[PDB]
């Protein structure tokens, strides 16, 4: 709940005028549905995997996948952290093929 | 065919080494340490009121600037070679682009591909089309056909970024 | 044949690397910054009456002259290699020149090519003839024949520029 | 007539001593025969094509073609602006082949 | 065959780049201008009794020594490449040497070539034999045979220079 | 198989260029000549009591340190390339190591090779085993078998050096 | 006997404190058994061969073979000086294969 | 005799210390045997031919042939000046084939 609290603190500082804001607001809502989908995942070990994700990808690509797929995002990062070898190969590779594995993760559901 | 002919002519232009001046990577020489600011009487007052340490560390600064500018020019050569190699791989994937255009003319044979391709070129930037033909070579013709059948979808695609387009397209492809 | 023999002998002379001293590109070393003008008492009076900044910026000037003269000599090597490559491409297009002279002797067979070619060589500078044989290899013989049939046109061509002359060459060719 | 006026103003400033002048004078006369050849063309839509020409080629090559061919220059630029795809390909290419199309434009006349 | 095997093994040793330390061309760095001799009080007395011109021209001397030593090392690289190319052409002509030894074993078939070749190797320096096999490949076997038939002529050839010996070789060849 | 799988996986790790930081050869920059010790008043008293020769030879020392540090870094690159080439040749001889492990599994087929190989790995350092498999590839399995049949000989081999431990290996091989 | 005298002089200087000493002492004893094996060889022409050996190999490898094989060392160097072509090829080659010929020299005895 | 006098003057200046000298001395002796061979030729018209030779070849190649063939040099240059067409063709050609005609001149004698 602490990460939600700090994200909400940053966003309320943004809306208070402590200055590009519209997408951040959509990221607030997409994070709400993100943790909804995290409950939908219901494998309580995903916290270390998502910690590893934020520490290994830049915030930009994580934000992109966070906003793209509101209903499957938690499972997407959980299973790409399950196979982080492909995560680093896609750190070397262009994001199009990583996007393809994201789409196949959509394919299973 | 004429569009393919100009594409392949650009290809042999690239393969020989016709590299535009804009593509010439100019070395980013780091600034040299200043002369007056360091080795003036104020610098002497820093270093116990003597010209000695000023000349010492300025000779050292000369040397370090020499090595960092040398590394800058050697880099300039290095990413010039890297740019040459990325022209080579571009050229390769454009060879498969020309070959898949041959393949589309060989296999598709159903639609009015010429004018729909013209409309798609006129609509989207060439980079998006290049990515489409690189990742979806054989279906690119049918994809342009279905996009031409949907001009409303076409100017969504115009209004929005190339990568996204990828999927939704990829998607659209797997919807069909 | 003897003219072709001397042309091809010049060719093997070029291919081995017989490069005349006039073709040796001497490096254009930029002038070094002056010694007395910068680092004298007048320079000291510029820089708050001290030998300090004078020695500082003169060491800096030494360093920058070292790098610019180094870049000058490295360039001299670079355009020496460029000149070698342009000798190679010349040599190539002169190989097609000798081969098209073979082709003219093989195909034309109609005119008195030797003396008309001699007259054309005696009239125009060799550069114009080289450009003519490079761009219009097979028709060059008939072109010299028709020019010899028109001495008045011949000394117009003599009086006027090479690029300019060819037009004549070319629109005369498409008149025939 | 405005472009003629500004060219003549620049050239009379040059001849007044406001400083390479001999070729500029020959360019004055070659521009006179240029607009003579423009009347010889007599397709009144060439103004936008020649505007595009000056804005896409450097002044040097336009000057070269202007001085080379006094009697056909207007038609030369009109028809190379008709096909400006070859104009940009020759911006990429050496000027020798562009010169070849100039010569073929001479060939039609 | 074993002599041919060791010759060709030396060949693949050369082709990979096994270059002996004696063949490493050390750069000939020109001497730097002297420090005390130029920029002492005697030099000052030359230049109107002041340290000024001494430091000026010594910085200039530093710069010119930097460029001449740089040209020296760049040359060292240049004739190192030239030496590599002359190893390549040596290697080529030794490839024809091995191939003509094959040809001699194929064609001659008449004499006791092995021991006469051994005697010729034991007599003359290897450079003379290399030149003989380079210019007269096919007849070299019969030439060694006729020289072995003439030991008195053999030790004239030993006593006298390689170029001269050759004519001998050659006008003996055209005597036969 | 799993040991062979990890060996070959290390192989493809090496072939791509995964080079550990310990294998990064740091350049050995020679020390720069000292500043105070040379160009102080004691140095002036050496050179006839003047700052002149001190600045002269210190500029010279700057230049020579620049060239020796430059040669040091160019060397660092040179033995980095040499280290890359020795990784390539290791990789080659480890490719024959994996291939001879295939060959042993194909041909030997008699002994319990897995656990005897495990014991031999646990006993001797990996370098000795690497040399054994490099020089005696096919017999290495039977050699480990006979060593496992002789634990007393095994811990002699442990107690004593690899070149000799090997002797042991080889004259044991020719005893059998 | 002169080489024994100079080796013993160097070693007694070492033991006197004129400075890595333990292996030198073992080299004293291994040289004693070396010349024992030299008598075992009993072909009195080996002196020039061993002179050539010391002048063509570094002292390190000669010392290594001297210490490795106390009972066969004299014959080893006598027969590698008999074939010094292999000696120089092993100067070019790694010492492992030279060691293999040393082992085969052990094989004959 | 004047050319001998000037050559000897240059060589005695060289030996006096007015400075690569050993080959010049051998050239003195080879010139002595050169004019011995010139007497052996005994066709008194060779002076203009050798004047033409020195004025058409560089001194280096003339010196090389002078030193190579002490006994036949005069006839060599006399007959290559007889056919100076081959002399200029070999000015264009590499010296190896000129050397071949020198060898055939040796073949006649």
Numbering used by the authors:
A (entry chain B), D (entry chain F), G (entry chain H), H (entry chain G): 70 to 88, 156 to 245
B (entry chain A), C (entry chain C), E (entry chain D), F (entry chain E): 70 to 245
From the article:
The four blades of each windmill-like structure in the outer dome were connected to the inner dome through a column, with one blade contributed by a side nodule. The results indicated that each windmill-like structure comprised four gp8 subunits, constituting a gp8 tetramer. Each blade comprised a base dimer. The outermost part of each blade was not part of the gp8 tetramer but was instead contributed by the base domain of a neighboring gp8 subunit. The gp8 tetramer was stabilized through a four-helix bundle formed by the four-column domains. The tetramers interacted with other gp8 subunits in neighboring tetramers through electrostatic interactions between the base domains. Local reconstruction of the top region of the outer dome revealed that this region comprised gp8 tetramers. The SP tetramer primarily forms through interactions of the C-terminal region (residues 122–136) within the column domain; this explains why a recombinant SP fragment (residues 141–303) does not form tetramers.
Tailed double-stranded DNA (dsDNA) bacteriophages and their eukaryotic counterparts, such as herpesviruses, possess a dodecameric portal at a unique vertex of the capsid; this portal serves as a channel for DNA packaging during viral assembly and delivery. The portal interacts with multiple copies of a scaffolding protein (SP) to form a nucleation complex, which initiates the assembly of the major capsid protein (i.e., coat protein) and other minor proteins into a procapsid. In this study, we present the structure of the SP gp8 in complex with the dodecameric portal in the P22 procapsid at subnanometer resolution.
